[PDB]
Nucleic acid binder design. Structure first.
Ligand SMILES: N[C@@H](CCC(=O)N[C@@H](CS)C(=O)NCC(=O)O)C(=O)O
Ligand SMILES: N[C@@H](CCC(=O)N[C@@H](CS)C(=O)NCC(=O)O)C(=O)O
Lengths: 236, 236
DNA sequence: TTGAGGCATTAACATTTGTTAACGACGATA
DNA sequence: TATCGTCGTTAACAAATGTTAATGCCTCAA
């Protein structure tokens, strides 16, 4: 992306150099209250939350370039306690102090509008996801998540659309769709397989019937069409 | 609150005058995508979405002052096809075309930071809502919505906490929690009534065991503590 | 006073999902 | 080689939830 590159050159120009993170490494966490402005430049991360009981919840993934806020810009208080775990092998991200961000965006308006637009992307994303997950229950939740991962990490292959993700354990899918037990998600997956919707090959997932997921995730497909059209046309 | 008043005067200085809307009246709609930037100054509204089969989905409410984006500020494209129905008797809102917002914000930076902060409140809200509703299924979703309504529209009474909403039918809660049929909502509400959690009196809902809802909506309570701390202190 | 329609409560069945357990395939270690 | 853990299936049983129908309470219009 161009806006992302200009943003990079701006940050670096203002003495803000990137940091490197490895897999299983947290950029910020839900226990230390350090309000940051993460500009995930390269890599893949997952935003997670752990309850008092210890239950994990995968709220979303982030694939650079994108912006993640852990604190408000005016009050400089916390927007919510979450972790951002690196799940790719390596990732490069620009950690910015919450106070300096205001000084940086005040100076340049283009980059300001870039951050604003990434924010809108977050909003619309969350609304669509909430819709498609809420209506059709857990089957619809799984289907929606598969749609997201297929548009973001999917590549056409002889047998279908291969989702290029190193770790996609049943536990992870459950964490992304509010399912606590791997057996249940394994059952839903078994149904989808039997309906000739997906295949489990090479420890990976191959999506062969995209329309089936489109039915259970209308607002998500619509969203990718209205906000990530470059990512949407690669499969249409 | 106050930043919204300064924002009001700002809008009334650039020739952007408020428009009035009555109950059930829509400001923008899904089928006629004109990209606006609604600044709900006063009143209560609800953001809804209708599938192709007619299924309704209540994504959330909006009690002024707040900001709603129907289109992106850069691309000027729709962020998603949603409707905004007024559910209060009367509501005052400033309608702004999306192309004007970029200049109007470029002119003043404090109000830019206001809209930005409100958008961050939207983000945190959606994330917390997604986590709680998702973790404990439909019971937890009902508890979450009830907590939200209790913080935003609740007022302490000797009978508990009165949710000052005229129209809060079983079907409306269902739409707010992804439940299609009113009978199921009635069933859950009956369980809570038996559990000494709430009571249905004077055509309104009264909350007596806030903690019970806090258990099923931890991230939402956290959100009210972090994003709307006054609304949170009003009940603690 | 009557009748229609909408909303709430409940019951009864079907479908889905939660929860635990057993079995087998796989990798890794010694 | 054997042994231990982890993950994917499947089964069996319980709880939740989807779905429909019946009933009663209320308002409203004639
Ligand atoms: N950098 C890309 C992708 C940014 C990104 O990661 N967006 C989030 C939503 S705000 C996403 O697609 N997440 C995918 C997921 O949740 O797995 C863009 O500009 O849209
Ligand atoms: N103006 C009030 C309320 C703004 C508002 O409506 N915020 C949304 C969250 S983005 C909300 O609380 N919605 C409650 C609901 O969904 O009923 C404030 O800023 O605290």
């Amino acid at each position: 992306n161009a806006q992302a590159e200009e943003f990079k050159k701006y940050l670096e120009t203002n003495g803000i150099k990137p940091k490197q993170f490895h897999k299983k490494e947290l950029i910020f966490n839900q226990w230390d209250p350090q309000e940051y402005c993460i500009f995930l430049y390269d890599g893949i991360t997952k935003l997670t939350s752990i309850s008092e009981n210890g239950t994990i919840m995968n709220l979303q993934y982030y694939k650079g370039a994108f912006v993640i806020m852990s604190g408000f810009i005016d009050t400089e208080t916390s927007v919510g306690y979450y972790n951002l775990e690196v799940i790719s092998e390596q990732a490069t991200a620009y950690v910015i102090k919450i106070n300096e961000l205001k000084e940086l965006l005040s100076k340049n308006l283009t980059h300001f509008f870039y951050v604003f637009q990434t924010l809108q992307k977050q909003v619309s994303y969350s609304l669509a996801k909430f819709n498609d997950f809420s209506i059709n229950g857990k089957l619809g939740s799984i289907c929606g998540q598969l749609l997201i991962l297929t548009y973001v990490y999917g590549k056409e292959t002889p047998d279908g659309i291969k989702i290029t993700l190193d770790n996609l354990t049943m536990q992870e899918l459950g964490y992304s769709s509010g399912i606590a037990h791997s057996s249940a998600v394994s059952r839903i997956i078994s149904k989808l397989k039997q309906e000739k919707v997906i295949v489990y090959k090479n420890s990976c997932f191959y999506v062969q019937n995209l329309d089936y997921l489109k039915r259970y995730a209308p607002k998500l497909d619509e969203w990718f069409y209205l906000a990530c059209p470059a990512t949407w046309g690669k499969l249409n």
